[PDB]
């Protein structure tokens, strides 16, 4: 189902795309996994721990 829906978006069905190194501009070998993940900021804040 993920493969189908990714095709509906017109994106690579394997979910990896080639990325260019922002410093030099050369491409990375072997395209890498990109995509959106839901992340959380925990209550452990450096401001308090220092």
């Amino acid at each position: 189902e993920i493969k189908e829906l990714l095709k509906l978006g017109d994106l690579p069905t394997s979910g990896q795309i080639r990325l260019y190194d922002g410093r030099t501009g050369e491409q990375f070998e072997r395209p890498v996994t990109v995509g959106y993940m839901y992340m959380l900021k925990l209550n452990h804040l450096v401001d308090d721990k220092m």
Partner: protein, 51 residues
């Protein structure tokens, strides 16, 4: 107030002074090591990866 002069004196004191880093479970004698400090921005301690 903490103007540039204080930062210069702090830099000069820190130069050759070593500080000790320890982690609460000091298993063996390498749980305490001394390092030469490098002043950096932020509130997080940066330690060399290899160690």
């Amino acid at each position: 107030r903490e103007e540039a002069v204080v930062w210069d004196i702090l830099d000069e004191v820190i130069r050759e002074h070593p500080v000790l880093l320890n982690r609460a479970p000091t298993l063996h004698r390498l749980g305490i090591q001394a390092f030469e400090p490098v002043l950096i921005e932020g509130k997080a301690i940066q330690l060399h990866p290899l160690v």
